[PDB]
C-alpha cells in the first residue's frame, strides 16, 4: 500500500493541510480538558454572616477587618476559617488584651447561611454556583475522575464503532457531540447534570483522539509517520498556551465553556471534506469508493499518475492484510508467550504512569504556583522544545535512555517541589513547569517506544493496552488529590514517586534503535 501512496504522494501539500486541520482540533481538544483548572477554580470562602454581609444592617465605626474578626474563627490553616462561624458576635475578641481561650467550639456553627466568594480573579466558577466547599469539597476531583472515565469507556467504544462505520465519519459525530455536549454543559441547572454532560462530552473526546492519530498514519508515509505523531503532539502544547489566553480573556464559567465549545461546530463542517481512509475502503471490499478517495488526493498533490491508478492494484496490493487480519488476537495472548510479558508489564507500567502523573499535576496547578494564567502557558511554552528533543534524542541516543531519562526527569523535579520552602514559589513553580516538560517528552518516547518494542501481528493490540492502562491511571490521578487533608505533599509525593519508579524500570526494556 506504500506504493499506491508513492503513486499518490507519501508527503505532500494534501498531508501538509490535513495536518494543519487536524491539528487545529486538538489545541481546542485540548482547552476542554484543562478548561477546569479555571472553570472549577476555588475561590476564596467564609461564612455568610449578618455583621459582615448584611449590607442594610445598622453600621459601625469598626473597619472590615475587625468585623472579619469578630464574626468568624482563625482557622487551621492559620487563616481565617473557611467552613466554622461564630454563633454570637465576639465582641470581646476586639480588644489587643484578648487570647484565643477566650472562646470554644460551643460558640461556633457551620455556614448556616452559606458561603461568600472572592470576585477578584474569577467573576464565577463551579465551585461557587453548586458550593463544592468545605462538606462538598470532594465533589470536583469526583467531577474530573467522571470526565476521564468518560474518556476510557469512549475509547472503549470507538474502536469497534472505528472499524464498523470507518475513521473520518467517527470523527465527524465525535465533532458534533464534543460541539452539543460541552454547549449543554455550559447552561446546566444543577451539579449531576453537569458531570452527566462533562461525561458525555469526554466521550466523544476519546473518539476524536483516536481516530485523528489513526487517520493521520494511513495517509502517511511511513518514513515520516514518527515526525506526524510528534507535530500532533505539539497541537496540545498550543492548546496548554491557547487555554492560558481564553481564561485571561473570559473570567465566567459559562461563557468559557461556551467559548471554548463553539468552535467544534466548524471542526463538524470542514470534517466533511477530508477523504476517508483508502486501507478502510479497500480492506472492507469498496475499492471503487477507495480510487476515487485517492485519485482526490493525487489531484490535491498534484500528480499525473490519476491517469494510471485502475482498481486492480488497489485491489491486490492490500489483499495480504485482508486476509490477514480475518484471525482474532487477544490481550490474553500478549501474557502467554514467555518473553514478550516482561516487556508488556513494564510498557503498560509507563503508560500508566504517564497517564497518572499528567492527569493529576495538570488539573491542579493552583497548588504548584501562584499565577495559574503564567503557569498555564509556561506549561506549553516548555512543551514545546522538550517534545522536540525528545524526537531528536531518541533518533540519536535511542529509546531507552530518553525514556527512561524523561520519567527519571519528571519524577526528580516533581519529589523536589515538595521540598522546597512554600515561600519560594517561584522556584516551585519552575520546577513544575520542568516536571510536566518531562512528561510530556516521556509521552512523546513510549508512544514511539511502545510500537517498536513487540511483533507486528501483537503491536495493536499491546498499545492498545498500554493506552488503556493510561487512561485507566488518568482516573486515579485526580482522586489522589483527596489525600491532602494530611497534608498537601503526600498528593505531591505519590506523583512522583509513580514516575520515578516506573522510569527506573524502563531502564530493564531493550533498544529498539538500528545498528
Ligand atoms: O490526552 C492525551 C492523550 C493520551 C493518550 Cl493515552 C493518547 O494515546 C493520546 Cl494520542 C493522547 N494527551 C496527550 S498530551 O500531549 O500528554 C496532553 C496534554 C494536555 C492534555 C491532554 C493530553
Ligand atoms: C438584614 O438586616 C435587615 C435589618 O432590618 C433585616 O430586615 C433582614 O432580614 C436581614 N437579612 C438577612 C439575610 O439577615
Not at 40 to 57: E, Q
Not at 292 to 305: C, D, F, M, P, S
Request: aromatic share 10%; hydrophobic share 50%; with cysteine.
Amino acid at each position: 500500500f506504500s506504493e499506491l501512496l508513492d503513486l499518490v504522494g507519501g508527503l505532500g501539500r494534501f498531508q501538509v493541510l490535513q495536518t494543519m486541520a487536524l491539528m487545529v482540533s486538538i489545541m481546542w481538544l485540548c482547552t476542554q480538558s484543562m478548561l477546569e483548572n479555571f472553570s472549577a477554580a476555588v475561590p476564596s470562602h467564609r461564612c455568610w454572616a449578618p455583621l459582615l454581609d448584611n449590607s442594610t444592617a445598622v453600621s459601625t465605626s469598626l473597619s472590615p477587618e475587625a468585623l472579619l474578626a469578630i464574626s468568624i474563627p482563625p482557622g487551621p490553616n492559620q487563616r481565617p476559617h473557611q467552613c466554622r462561624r461564630f454563633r454570637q458576635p465576639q465582641w470581646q475578641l476586639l480588644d489587643p488584651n484578648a487570647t484565643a481561650t477566650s472562646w470554644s467550639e460551643a460558640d461556633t456553627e457551620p455556614c448556616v447561611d452559606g458561603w461568600v466568594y472572592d470576585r477578584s480573579i474569577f467573576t464565577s466558577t463551579i465551585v461557587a454556583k453548586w458550593n463544592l466547599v468545605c462538606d462538598s469539597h470532594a465533589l470536583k476531583p469526583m467531577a474530573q475522575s467522571i470526565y476521564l472515565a468518560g474518556i476510557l469507556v469512549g475509547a472503549a467504544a470507538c474502536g469497534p464503532a472505528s472499524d464498523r462505520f470507518g475513521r473520518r465519519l467517527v470523527l465527524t459525530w465525535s465533532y458534533l457531540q464534543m460541539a452539543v455536549m460541552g454547549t449543554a454543559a455550559a447552561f446546566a441547572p444543577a451539579f449531576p447534570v453537569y458531570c452527566l454532560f462533562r461525561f458525555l462530552l469526554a466521550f466523544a473526546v476519546a473518539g476524536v483522539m483516536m481516530n485523528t492519530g489513526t487517520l493521520l498514519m494511513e495517509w502517511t508515509a511511513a518514513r515520516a509517520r514518527p515526525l506526524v505523531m510528534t507535530l500532533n503532539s505539539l497541537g496540545f502544547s498550543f492548546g496548554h498556551g491557547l487555554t492560558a489566553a481564553v481564561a485571561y480573556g473570559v473570567r465566567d464559567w459559562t461563557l468559557l465553556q461556551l467559548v471554548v465549545s463553539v468552535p467544534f461546530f466548524l471542526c463538524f463542517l470542514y470534517s466533511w471534506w477530508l477523504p476517508e481512509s483508502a486501507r478502510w475502503l479497500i480492506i472492507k471490499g469498496k475499492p471503487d469508493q477507495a480510487l476515487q478517495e485517492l485519485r482526490k488526493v493525487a489531484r490535491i498533490n498534484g500528480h499525473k499518475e490519476a491517469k494510471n491508478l485502475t482498481i486492480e492494484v488497489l485491489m491486490s496490493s492490500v489483499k495480504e492484510e485482508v486476509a490477514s487480519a480475518k484471525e482474532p488476537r487477544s490481550v490474553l495472548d500478549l501474557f502467554c508467550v514467555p518473553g514478550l510479558r516482561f516487556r508488556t508489564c513494564i510498557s503498560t507500567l509507563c503508560w500508566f504512569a504517564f497517564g497518572f502523573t499528567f492527569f493529576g499535576l495538570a488539573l491542579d496547578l493552583q497548588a504548584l504556583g501562584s499565577n495559574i494564567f503564567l503557569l498555564q502557558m509556561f506549561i506549553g511554552v516548555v512543551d514545546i522544545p522538550a517534545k522536540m528533543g525528545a524526537l531528536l534524542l531518541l533518533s540519536h541516543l535511542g529509546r531507552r535512555p530518553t525514556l527512561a531519562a524523561s520519567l527519571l526527569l519528571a519524577g526528580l523535579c516533581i519529589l523536589a517541589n515538595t521540598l522546597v520552602p512554600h515561600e519560594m514559589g517561584a522556584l516551585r513553580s519552575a520546577l513544575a513547569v520542568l516536571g510536566l516538560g518531562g512528561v510530556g517528552a516521556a509521552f512523546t518516547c513510549i508512544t514511539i517506544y511502545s510500537s517498536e518494542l513487540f511483533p507486528t501481528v501483537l503491536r495493536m493490540t499491546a498499545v492498545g493496552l498500554g493506552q488503556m492502562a493510561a487512561r485507566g491511571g488518568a482516573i486515579l490521578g485526580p482522586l489522589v488529590r483527596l489525600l491532602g487533608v494530611h497534608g498537601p505533599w503526600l498528593p505531591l509525593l505519590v506523583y512522583g514517586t509513580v514516575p520515578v519508579l516506573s522510569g527506573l524500570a524502563a531502564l530493564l526494556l531493550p533498544e529498539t534503535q538500528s545498528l
